[PDB]
Amino acid sequence: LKELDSQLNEPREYIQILERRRAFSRWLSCTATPQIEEEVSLTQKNSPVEAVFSYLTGKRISEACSLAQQSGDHRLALLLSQFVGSQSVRELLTMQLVDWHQLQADSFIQDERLRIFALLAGKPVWQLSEKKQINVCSQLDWKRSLAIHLWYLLPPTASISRALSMYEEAFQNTSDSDRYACSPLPSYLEGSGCVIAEEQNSQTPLRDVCFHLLKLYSDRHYDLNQLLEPRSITADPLDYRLSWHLWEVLRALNYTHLSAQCEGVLQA
C-alpha cells in the first residue's frame, strides 16, 4: 500500500522480492523488541555485553553502539557502528577469531564478547581452544533465531526462502553437524520447556502459523492443512476464527490446493 505502490509502472519481481525482505526485516525486529527491552532492563546494570548482544539480536545497532559508548567499551561501539554493509569487516573478524584460536589467546577474552564477535563475523557457532563452543543462537526464541539467519549469516542480496532454509538446516538432525537453532513453535508453547519427545503417532510435528505462511511464501505448493489447523494459531482446537479468515484470503490470493473435505471441515 506504500513502497511498491509508488511505482507508475509494473513492479519487477526483483523489487517485490526486495521490498518483501525489507518489510520482513522490520517484522523480525517488531517480534523481538519487548523481550529485548526486558532483557536489557535486567542485564544493563550487571553486564552491558549481554544488553549490547540483546539489542543486536533485534537489529537495534544504534542503541547497541549508544550503550557501548555509555559503558566505556568505545572500540566495541566503533566496530558495531560500521557493521551495516561492508563485508570486509565480517572477513576481518573471521581472520581475527581464527588467529585468537590458533594462538590460544581466545581463552583470555569474555565468552559473551566472543559471542558478539562470532555474530558479526557471520559464525552461528564458534569452536574455542578450550573445546568450549559458543552458540550465538543459544537461549534465544525462534523469531530472533530466524532473524540472525536473515541479518548476520547472509548477504543483503539473499532471499527470505534462503534465510528460512538455513534456519531449518540449523534445528534438524544431520549426520555431520550438531543442532544450533531452536524449533519454530506457536507463541502459546514458547517458554514452556517442552522438549517434544518425538511423538510415536504424530508424524507431522506442530509449528507456528507464521512459520507455515513463511513456507507457503517460500514454496507455492507447501501444505495448507497444517497452516489452517487451529493448533498452529491458538491453545484451542475449537477456535476457527483465524483459520477461516486465512483460507478466505488464500482463496482470494489464488491458492487452490486445499481438499474439499478440509474446506468442508473448516466451513462446518
Partner: protein, 289 residues
C-alpha cells in the same frame, strides 16, 4: 603534461645525482636546490593542468545544467550531484588530489621495506609477557602493563604496552598517517591488514558515503555501499581525536576523516601538509553542509 614529463625527467636525473653525493660535499648544494626548484616546478605544472581544465570545462557547460534532485537520494548521490553543481567544492578537491599526489611521489616504492619487532602477532611482546606472567615460575619484576589484549585495553585501563610493541604501534601509526596524507587509504588499510590490526583495517572504511541502488529498483540484487551511520561514526572519530591519551598520528588519522582540523594541524609539518589540512577539511565540511 609534456612540461611535467620534462621537469619530472630532470627531477629523476638530479635525484639520481644527489642520491650519489657523499654527505657534506658542499658542491652539491646547487644540485639539491636545482632538484627542489624543478620538483616544485613539476607539481606547479600539475596544478595548472588540473585547475585551468576544470575552469574551461565549467565555462562551456554552465548554459545547460537544469538539474533536478531526487527525493529518495542517498548521501553518495547528493555528493555525486554536489561535484557537478559546485565548482568551489570541485576545485577544492583538485587541490586535495594535487597535494596528496605530492606526498605519494615522495613515498614511491618503499612500503614493503618496513621492519617491525612484532612478526607473528599483534602486540606480540606484551602477549608473550602476559603468558610468561601466567606461569608460576615468574620471578621477574612486575612492570605495570595492560592485562587485556583488545585494542581499547591501553585507554580503558590507562596502562602501557611493553616498549617493543610500543615502538611498532608508533612506527605503524606514522606510516598509516603518511599513506592517508597521500590518498593511499587502501594501502593504509592493507598495512593494518599486514600488521595484524584487523580492527584498524576496518576503522579506515567508516567514512564512506551511504548508498543502496535498489531503493530506485535496479534489475539484479546490486550491492549496498558505505555507512548509514557515517554521522555517528564521524562523531565517534572526533571523540578519538580529542583525548590526549591517543597518539598524535591516530588523532590525525581520524581527524582527516571527520573534519577535525584542530587535531589534524598538530601533525601537518610542511607547507603542503598545512594547505592540505585546510583543503581536506574544507571539502569534508562543505560535503557535510
Amino acid at each position: 603534461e609534456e612540461y611535467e614529463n620534462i621537469c619530472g625527467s630532470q627531477v629523476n636525473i638530479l635525484s639520481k645525482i644527489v642520491s650519489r653525493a657523499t654527505p657534506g660535499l658542499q658542491k652539491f648544494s646547487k644540485t639539491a636546490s636545482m632538484l627542489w626548484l624543478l620538483q616544485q616546478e613539476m607539481v606547479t605544472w600539475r596544478l595548472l593542468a588540473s585547475l585551468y581544465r576544470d575552469r574551461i570545462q565549467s565555462a562551456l557547460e554552465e548554459e545547460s545544467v537544469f538539474a533536478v534532485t531526487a527525493v529518495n537520494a542517498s548521501e553518495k548521490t547528493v555528493v555525486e550531484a554536489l561535484f557537478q553543481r559546485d565548482s568551489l567544492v570541485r576545485q577544492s578537491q583538485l587541490v586535495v588530489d594535487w597535494l596528496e599526489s605530492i606526498a605519494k611521489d615522495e613515498i614511491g616504492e618503499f612500503s614493503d621495506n618496513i621492519e617491525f619487532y612484532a612478526k607473528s602477532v599483534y602486540w606480540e611482546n606484551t602477549l608473550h609477557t602476559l603468558k610468561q606472567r601466567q606461569l608460576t615460575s615468574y620471578v621477574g619484576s612486575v612492570r605495570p602493563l595492560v592485562t587485556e589484549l583488545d585494542p581499547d585495553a591501553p585507554i580503558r585501563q590507562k596502562m602501557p604496552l611493553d616498549d617493543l610493541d610500543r615502538e611498532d604501534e608508533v612506527r605503524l601509526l606514522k606510516y598509516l598517517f603518511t599513506l592517508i596524507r597521500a590518498g593511499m587509504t587502501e594501502e593504509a588499510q592493507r598495512l593494518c591488514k599486514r600488521c595484524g590490526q584487523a580492527w584498524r583495517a576496518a576503522t579506515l572504511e567508516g567514512w564512506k558515503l551511504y548508498h543502496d541502488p535498489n531503493v530506485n529498483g535496479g534489475t539484479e540484487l546490486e550491492p549496498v555501499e558505505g555507512n548509514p551511520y557515517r554521522r555517528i561514526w564521524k562523531i565517534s572519530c572526533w571523540r578519538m581525536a580529542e583525548d590526549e591519551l591517543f597518539n598524535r598520528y591516530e588523532r590525525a588519522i581520524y581527524a582527516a576523516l571527520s573534519g577535525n582540523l584542530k587535531q589534524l594541524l598538530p601533525v601537518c609539518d610542511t607547507w603542503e601538509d598545512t594547505v592540505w589540512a585546510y583543503f581536506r577539511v574544507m571539502v569534508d565540511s562543505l560535503v557535510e553542509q
